[PDB]
Symmetry: C5
Subunit: 311 residues, 5 copies
């Protein structure tokens, strides 16, 4: 079966729609998500036209094999989608209404700069390659674009699922390709990071600062080095979940900066001891008293500066 | 093959049943479970009717291809179910009895608020899309809904497997859809968490409180910081298994609260030392004596308050 | 093709056999194992009978499609077995001899009570559903039940592979089902746990008891808390491999009990210090001297009691 | 269907092209990458030639089954590629233009010597085995070799995707094989390793060197041993991601060398204490003062030497 | 299609060959490897014979369906191999030459006794079951056994790929089975274990021995216990990669033995302190001086003895 012939030299418009049924497994590190949706397609094939008076029927149902169907593929998929044709309906004028249900592992990158206080635009790109007889162009039927109310992406809030209605038409290997951009706008549920990582991480840092109210070098060394190790554990846990980005992230900046605070606290603890040994405890006392204010103040300003740069 | 024609304008009732054979792999983090069950379907197709006297046979067996079979799908599946037709039987009146055995990875969310002392309702949603000629409606044949006594979900107790008999009929992409809710009510076997996480986690906390019967700052620092680190390890272990929830959980509340106890114990240990150094050990002694009672009392009340709020 | 017709009203006996070729991937946590075996089936179909004198041939080979074959399924499988038909042979009386080679992920639970000194009975349940015309019953042909000498389950010793010859015949959804129990009796190779977990775990415990020959509180705190942390690491390692059981296990009991020994050692260390500070070292000395004997004695008796209760 | 016959004695030239659509999952440890691309093939089959007047069509579309297609395989794949034929077009002279879209897990090794400041050449080898009637030879159609501008390999920069135009023609099992080398030149985005591993790892090392400004053996032992343990954690994290190479890597050399610095710091700390105890603090003081300069200087030179050897 | 008939009562010889293209994913813990190779088969079918003068053709190419092909399976595979037929060629005498390209996950056990200084013999067992009409026997065509020079098993050196030319013929379920043993002899690239595990593990042990040049109990306790914990980390890392063997391994013996050295060092440190407290430092001094020589000497001899027993 060949494609529908043109009345004049007009391209064949394949009207499309994606209706999300299930949306799951957003793997931040892999920059992939899994989708289970309806894909609706509609085009006119005048060869399939019939008089509803003579045929009696208002619609005709065909099996995929029986008629010409455009080869629509997804651009940003890992492997070709698992699809199962739900229905093919032909109206008297030869307007075909195709509907399939698919599942695919979509590969769409994320911007980790503001994580875990980030929003993302996930993309699903539909594409059609033109044939030798006819040039095929994609369209968005907005009435057939949507999502189920139940659609739950774990740890994310779904804001919108819309399509950029004008296709990106371009030549590829001396044939026209018509690409459509479906955008799933989501935003991260940052809540759990506050009691699980952020607050634990701050408590261990504040525990290191108790060394500014201690003259015991042996105890201070323990306080600052032990807490530094706990910070390393959190840094490792975090980087095992976040992918390695060519750009600096907000979480990255904060986690790194905190190392400097541990490093400088070790210097303070060392300086204080050296002076106490050198029989200069008055000077050590001045440095320790300053540190008590300096450390939280510099920490607060540094965070204000970082938050400002990133948001 | 087209759907059965109506005797008036009645919808086609497809009677359904799910009989669980195997029920496994409840992945709390993924909010998925795997099921292996029988799916039974029954509808009347008058075109298949026969006189048992003339045909001799009381029943006729057909191959799926030979007759019209309704396209029943599962809503909340990752990928389309692996199904293998067991039997298709037609009675003289044209009543079809279909039976298949399937396996599917069902995606049903969990409420982690009371974990690990939680119960869940897992769902399996059956659905059928209406055709242009006939509107298809699902029904529950209660005699064909059940589970094997052997059905064992590891780390969970199966309470019930029932169906909400009235289908949810609604329009989707300008066609009627008939949805049925099958509910598997389960409850967590919390036992192992008591000797594995809960009691170990309490023992390390109580070990930190031995610092209230010690004047050795260096030893106290070791006690409180070491145990804090062991608590961090347990917190990490727990959050690697529990998914990140937009809501506060009972396990989350407790784990977080305990950090405050470690933080305040470090403050106490610091204050006690500072005073001992400042040649004020009487005041330090009063604070230490109070802490001995205050810490367990506040811990017990805080837990009473939390348990109350959550249960 | 319909099932073979009965001479009188007798059920159709399908003689079965399973011959293990490969037996691998026993995942204790998942309570699954993978099997690769021969499945042999044999039944009489009088319609296939021939005179070996007239036909010349002593046997006839058929393709699965050519004849009626009973639908045999496995009960406790995750997904339906990957099977590839090896041979179908018909004798002059119409006795069919079917042989296929399959692979399946069998789901059979384990009793972790005595782990790692435990034995298990793995099961493979064969089943057949009766048809409308004839009732099908399973049988065990013992000459066709066995295992390859090479069959190696890693970390386990294969004791036996036998079948419970009497099938479990029962009604399920108003049809007879005939179930056969194939049992693979195995026993754990516990050896490696002795040098890898058991002895390391005891050495760290005995290191904590060296605090009973020390008056240095600071050193004792370090000994007992450090070793407690190493025990937590081993506890975590162990529970990451063992599934969460609703019952107490031998490994669970021991690992838990050891926490009590660490907890009580911390109390001893605390009491000894308090008394030494209170200028009562004679009393502290008596308590420390007792602990030296009490701790190993109570440890040995507690283990004797536990081993007795579990074995 | 047999291969096209030769006019003369010429081999059959199959012109090839690979156009990368998606390029993902570079697993350094596994030395594999996943690709999703177009594979274009073109050859002349004079048997397929036609008159466009008689057939009406100027080009003919065939299903793969309908005609002879060369069996092109990938050499360095794990499993045979998932391919889905996009189009097969025959021109009146019998010139066939085949296009499929595939996904494959390509197995191409990496040189970890300069990691994470390394570049790689990934390979995709196309191959065709000659038949008994005709010898088949591969060619590169450069106009059909390329990549999408969007093609993003996470944590890597794509430099080029080119083909070595001359095939490697050789005998294999008494038949000619024609192999083509497609090369994807990439280079690692090393950035994230600086704040995540490199700088944390240096800070802990520099913290160990604060023991050269301390006379407290107990504190020094803590500083050097604690930081040594944090270095072990980083070493483990790194080797869990990098494969085990038979050659020394730059990351390997650095990580190993740092152990020597920790080992020697422990010796210094031990020597300093021994002398202080032996009532020789003047000698200990000289050794400690030297260490303050020696340790960073030797560290800097050692790194200069290593960087020089590796780059 | 039936098998070739015998001239006289002779078995049918199927000549075989395996030519490795790709050899990857040796999973020591799983005792599996993945292979991608050519499988060549050749037998005489006199029914396929032709006169090359009358037929014109020197060879005939058949589709698998067209002729009788022996059912060859692999014994030690997880699941049946993914195979794709490359060619089937018949010579005038009826000599068939079959060639397919396959991929399979082969399950062949390893002897971990000498790891990581171990060599292995991996096996690929080819098998054929005799049919009722003819008995089938396997043979090795040595000209068709080989490997690509590029064949690279990561972290292993490929020494040889040969076949044991005489098959293992045996009866299985009253039919002859002919088994061929293909052996891939490999040897581990132990290099990386020296800088990654072996040398780090020795450095931490030697750091524990610095306690023999210290009178500070508190510091010694820290040295020996901290390093013991780092040894536990390495032991865990190692056993997460090595499978649990019913026999003692070289790596196992060494790792275990080292615990005894840590245990005894703790005893020495304890004895030294007890004596120092008991105002007997002269005796403690003698014990400490002995330990300085005893510990390395006993370590070196113990290793000599172990290496001797294992190699
Ligand atoms: C360690 C210190 C951690 C500090 C965290 C600061 C977070 C922040 O300031 O995050 C910023 C986000 C804002 O999100 P936004 O919508 O992307 O702002 C976009 C604004 N534009 C469009 C103008 C650029 O704040 C929140 O959602 C509030 C939650 C903060 C909770 C922190 C608890 C501790
Ligand atoms: C650290 C401190 C941990 C304290 C744990 C308290 C658990 C609790 O109180 O859990 C609550 C559950 C109750 O389960 P429920 O049926 O959902 O109650 C629903 C009640 N309504 C319907 C009225 C709201 O108690 C149990 O099953 C008993 C097991 C507790 C063992 C704790 C051992 C320690
Ligand atoms: C920490 C302390 C750990 C103590 C371990 C005790 C093990 C035990 O006693 O295990 C019990 C098993 C017995 O196995 P069974 O056949 O199931 O006995 C069933 C007996 N009935 C049928 C009468 C009930 O002993 C063994 O196989 C011997 C190996 C023990 C090695 C321990 C080394 C340390
Ligand atoms: C003068 C002190 C020289 C120290 C040399 C140490 C050599 C270590 C070589 C390891 C080879 C692998 C192995 C244990 C090392 C212990 C070193 C103790 C130093 C004692 C200082 C006494 C001061 C007089
Ligand atoms: C611990 C110490 C770590 C030191 C790291 C040195 C890296 C280096 O010197 O890396 C070398 C690479 C160069 O890359 P190249 O193109 O392969 O040079 C090939 C040169 N030929 C062709 C002449 C042989 O430098 C970079 O890209 C710059 C980034 C360095 C950042 C380091 C931050 C700390
Ligand atoms: C003279 C001291 C001999 C020490 C022998 C130790 C035997 C341990 C055997 C473990 C068997 C498994 C188990 C605890 C070991 C504590 C040892 C304390 C040593 C006290 C020294 C006092 C100096 C007089
Ligand atoms: C902690 C101490 C670790 C000591 C390691 C000893 C290794 C050894 O002695 O290993 C033995 C292997 C020999 O390999 P083989 O061919 O199997 O010998 C078989 C001999 N027959 C056939 C006679 C029985 O030595 C090597 O390849 C050399 C590498 C050793 C590097 C060690 C660096 C440290
Ligand atoms: C500002 C101070 C520092 C703040 C703390 C740092 C938090 C920064 C955000 C880190 C984001 C982590 O991103 C983490 O990625 C992994 C991917 O490997 C996800 O991992 C998993 O997610 C869900 C289960 O929950 C699965 O459906 C998914 O398939 C799986 O990959 C985690 O659910 C996600 O949360
Ligand atoms: C109140 C103080 C704190 C109490 C301690 C905290 C306990 C809270 C409950 C945590 C629930 C953990 O939930 C954990 O999730 C993972 C999913 O990644 C499951 O993981 C696994 O389960 C089984 C094996 O056992 C598999 O069939 C499944 O496929 C797999 O994912 C764990 O079996 C489950 O137990
Ligand atoms: C008495 C004191 C305490 C003694 C120490 C405690 C030991 C108790 C027994 C623990 C049993 C651990 O059980 C562990 O389970 C996991 C499943 O996740 C298995 O894990 C793996 O096994 C093999 C590889 O070896 C694979 O084929 C399998 O697919 C995989 O899951 C481990 O091989 C098994 O050993
Ligand atoms: C000079 C001092 C030391 C410097 C620090 C050391 C860094 C050296 C380079 C280490 C390279 C690590 O290489 C690491 O390999 C694993 C493979 O298991 C990749 O692992 C993963 O990558 C991505 C997700 O992020 C997936 O698409 C991929 O399938 C998966 O395997 C890591 O993304 C990669 O970064
Ligand atoms: C004598 C003192 C002690 C010496 C140190 C101890 C070393 C002893 C040898 C340990 C062998 C470890 O064996 C380890 O097993 C795992 C199996 O999951 C392999 O794991 C992985 O290997 C490669 C990637 O590198 C993959 O293709 C493979 O699929 C994967 O399983 C490791 O590559 C292997 O190295
Ligand atoms: Cl697609
Ligand atoms: Cl479905
Ligand atoms: Cl099955
Ligand atoms: Cl391929
Ligand atoms: Cl096979
Ligand atoms: Cl025999
Ligand atoms: Cl035989
Ligand atoms: Na079509
Ligand atoms: Na300490
Ligand atoms: Na049908
Ligand atoms: Na059949
Ligand atoms: Na073809
Ligand atoms: Na055949």
């Amino acid at each position: 079966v060949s494609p529908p012939p043109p009345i004049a030299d007009e391209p064949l418009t394949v009207n499309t729609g994606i209706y999300l049924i299930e949306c799951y497994s957003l793997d931040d590190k892999a920059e992939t998500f899994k989708v289970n949706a309806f894909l609706s397609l509609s085009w006119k094939d005048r060869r399939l036209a019939f008089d509803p008076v003579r045929s009696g029927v208002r619609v005709k149902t065909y099996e995929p094999e029986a008629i010409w169907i455009p080869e629509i593929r997804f651009v940003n998929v890992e492997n070709a989608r698992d699809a199962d044709v739900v229905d093919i309906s032909v109206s008297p004028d030869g307007t075909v209404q195709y509907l399939e249900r698919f599942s695919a592992r979509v590969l769409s990158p994320l911007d980790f700069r503001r994580a875990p206080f980030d929003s993302q635009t996930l993309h699903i790109y539909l594409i059609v390659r033109s044939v030798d007889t006819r040039n095929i162009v994609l369209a968005v039927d907005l009435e057939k674009v949507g999502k189920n109310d139940d659609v739950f992406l774990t740890g994310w809030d779904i804001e919108s699922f819309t399509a950029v209605v004008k296709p990106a038409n371009f030549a590829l290997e001396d044939r026209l390709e018509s690409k459509l951009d479906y955008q799933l706008r989501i935003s991260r549920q940052y809540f759990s990071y506050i009691p699980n990582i952020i607050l634990p991480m701050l408590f261990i840092l504040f525990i290191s600062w108790t060394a500014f109210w201690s003259t015991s070098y042996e105890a201070n060394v323990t306080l600052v080095v032990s807490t530094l190790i706990a910070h390393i554990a959190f840094n490792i846990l975090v980087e095992t979940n976040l992918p390695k980005t060519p750009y600096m992230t907000y979480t990255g900046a904060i986690i790194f900066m905190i190392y400097l605070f541990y490093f400088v606290a070790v210097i303070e603890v060392t300086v204080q001891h050296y002076l106490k040994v050198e029989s200069q405890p008055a000077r050590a006392a001045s440095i320790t008293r300053a540190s008590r204010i300096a450390f939280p103040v510099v920490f607060l300003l540094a965070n204000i500066i970082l938050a400002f740069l990133f948001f």
